[PDB]
């Protein structure tokens, strides 16, 4: 029949081209090296290496939310990051309240450093809450713009009455006393009730005191009394919508009420912060497990061979062959007109194990079993004649399944199989040329060888952008309490509004309660 005739024809062709393959040791490997780059490398610059912008600055001169789907394809030279597309989760307004006292005297206690500034916090919060536009075209008051929140997560019963709920999300030190100035005045341990929920050890999540103060802990510690400083906090406003007129009016009203001398804050740009999806170690264990499985598989594919000259050479060559084949294929997928957007990181080991090494491995056995001792073209000829139709059937069997695999409707499986077919064909070509040339040169070489002023309020460029000195889990912790996610979205941070308070030391003496010199709280490890 035709089967034996076809076998004879293909064996004759294999024998004929084996001599040609062995005839050019250097030219063929040079061709392979040139083609490996030429086919795929120039377009490998286009994919993103992985780094990208996480903070985006937008001028406050004219701001509008970015379009969500105005363009089917985003412009190439556009500066807007891929996440800066939709509306932000919320706009965060910080009101940094620094303060100072008239000439310091010895009668002031440590509790005064907390009592004097926090006393005005309730009045400031009341002014912010009751502020309204007397002449407006759009919004009028804080109610129409504030991000309303209903209730906290279940299991956070301990934080009830210490965080806002059923109202606008407004954070201030007055939340410790529920914005009740009478309660704050009657409280006999201000530092104690401030540090009531302070953890005894370091915690990744943001502390309740840190959340309510909105300030890094170095500006609000008890140790400031030694340096004659004063506690500074921040009233945090969370905005569901943006209204330039209302924000400007609020800033102007605060500046009128509490003017801040020698203040030159720029208030020029918004800041957009995008939070990525944090991947835990739970999703990582299968990844490293399959990587080590791949390493074990390649190690077991090797170590089953014996070389006339080397002991690891052609094994390394086969590993390089498969790696370069897959690297060529992942790039040529773009030229094929198919989407290369697959993750790849977890695809790589399964792709390698699917490609396999049987075809390359079986080629070496007959070649090293060739009885010719001197001639190299001979050894190539008999070894390749022996291996004829064998690698062909192995490759055909390994590739036939992939067509049925991608004949289904699954998109990810289809992409995997489209990668696999081109990887297998590139592997076939590369083992047909580079591996046979390197084993030919190995065979060739084998036979050849054988006084004491209180510091004044300053508004330098460090007070601005103070949010970036907070804990990296500050904002996600705050929003998670209200069942709001930032995993796929971003937030916008408005410039801080400075507020400066002048305080009278005689006020602390007049309001000096008994037993003010003692408190249960004590700074741990400091």
């Amino acid at each position, epitope marked *: 029949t035709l089967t034996e005739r076809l076998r004879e024809k293909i064996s004759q062709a294999f024998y004929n081209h084996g001599l040609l393959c062995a005839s050019y040791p250097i030219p063929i490997i040079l061709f392979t090296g040139l083609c490996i780059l030429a086919c795929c490398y120039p377009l490998l610059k286009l994919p993103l290496p992985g780094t990208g912008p996480v903070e985006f600055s937008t001028p406050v001169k004219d701001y509008s939310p970015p379009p969500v789907d105005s363009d089917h394809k985003q412009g190439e030279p556009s500066e807007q990051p891929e996440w800066y597309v939709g509306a932000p989760v919320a706009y965060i307004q910080q009101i940094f309240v620094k303060s100072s006292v008239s000439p310091w005297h010895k009668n002031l206690l440590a509790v005064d450093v907390f009592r004097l500034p926090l006393s005005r916090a309730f009045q400031l919060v009341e002014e912010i809450r009751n502020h309204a*536009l*007397r*002449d407006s*075209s*759009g919004v009028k008051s804080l109610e129409e713009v504030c991000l309303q929140v209903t209730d906290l997560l279940p299991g956070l019963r301990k934080l009830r009455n210490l965080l806002p709920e059923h109202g606008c999300l407004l954070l201030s030190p007055g939340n410790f006393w529920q914005n009740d100035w009478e309660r704050f005045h009657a409280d006999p341990d201000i530092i104690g009730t401030i540090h009531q929920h302070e953890p005894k050890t370091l915690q990744t999540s943001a502390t309740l005191k840190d959340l309510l103060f909105g300030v890094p802990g170095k500006y609000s510690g008890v140790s400031l009394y030694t340096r004659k400083r004063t506690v500074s906090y921040t009233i945090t406003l969370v905005f569901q919508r943006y209204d330039s007129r209302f924000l400007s*009016s609020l800033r102007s009203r605060l500046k009128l009420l509490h003017p801040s001398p020698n203040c030159s804050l720029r208030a020029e740009n918004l800041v957009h912060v995008h939070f990525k999806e944090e991947i835990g170690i739970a999703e990582l264990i299968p990844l490293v497990t399959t990587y080590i499985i791949l390493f074990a598989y390649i190690y077991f594919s090797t170590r089953k061979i014996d070389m006339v000259k080397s002991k690891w050479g052609l094994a390394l060559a086969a590993v390089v062959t498969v790696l370069s084949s897959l690297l060529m294929s992942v790039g040529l997928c773009t030229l094929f007109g198919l989407t290369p957007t697959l993750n790849g990181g977890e695809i790589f080991p399964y792709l390698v194990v699917v490609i396999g090494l049987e075809n390359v491995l079986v080629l070496t056995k007959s070649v090293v079993s060739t009885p010719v001792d001197l001639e190299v073209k001979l050894r190539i000829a008999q070894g390749l004649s022996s291996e004829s139709w064998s690698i062909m059937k192995n490759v055909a069997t390994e590739l036939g399944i992939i067509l049925i695999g991608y004949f289904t409707l699954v998109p990810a499986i289809q992409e995997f199989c489209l990668f696999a077919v081109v990887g297998l064909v590139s592997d076939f070509f590369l083992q047909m040329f580079f591996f046979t040339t390197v084993l030919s040169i190995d065979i060739r070489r084998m036979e050849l060888a054988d006084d004491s002023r209180a510091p004044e309020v300053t508004w330098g460029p460090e007070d601005e952008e103070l949010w970036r000195r907070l804990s990296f889990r500050h904002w996600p912790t705050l929003f998670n309490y209200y069942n709001i996610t930032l995993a796929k979205r971003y937030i916008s941070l408005l410039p801080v509004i400075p507020v400066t308070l002048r305080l009278n030391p005689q006020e602390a003496l007049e309001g000096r309660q008994p037993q003010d010199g003692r408190s249960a709280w004590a700074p741990p490890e400091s």
Partner: antibody
Amino acid sequence: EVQLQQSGAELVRPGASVKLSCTASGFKIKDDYIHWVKQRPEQGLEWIGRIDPANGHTRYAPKFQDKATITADTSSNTAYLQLSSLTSEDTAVYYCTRYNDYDAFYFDYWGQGTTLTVSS
Amino acid sequence: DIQMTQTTSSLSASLGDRVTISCRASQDIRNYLNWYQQKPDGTVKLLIYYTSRLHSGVPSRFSGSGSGTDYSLTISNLEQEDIATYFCQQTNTLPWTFGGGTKLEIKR
């Protein structure tokens, strides 16, 4: 640097309508509101109304709710005040004004004022 | 609805003297009172806003004070260029109302 140039003096028989104009130089009218103030020789200054050019929202005093209408055009950077059914009580100087701060609400920059006279 | 009243329609004063101008609001306006100076040429300029804040470019010669319903404007030394008429405007209730205005002059 910031100027609000106004039109010339006007003389119109009673019963007609007058459309005074205000051109802003040095800034874009989208940023701030535009106001119109009427000053009779002895009755003192009076507030007519204002318009938000970026939105078109207008508000007037109860006296001028029906007498006066205020419109603006962002492209030409001008604002217009129109008086309907002119009567002898309308002989006054009209000032075009904006404000910068949105809590103090102070009329920082004023126009030169256009004298308007109505008579037979 | 709020009416501002300047009882002293004319306030004769000499050059180099300190001059005070006061207007009374019908009700409390919460320190929202601005002062405007209108030259005889007809131009109008803003002197003081909120209740005592000096506008940009206004000389420190002008100052203001007051609270509740009583407010005042003071001139350190009356200059020739300061001979004009002054109005006080309230910005507490939306229909902004101006004062009756007072005119300065030199003694004869």
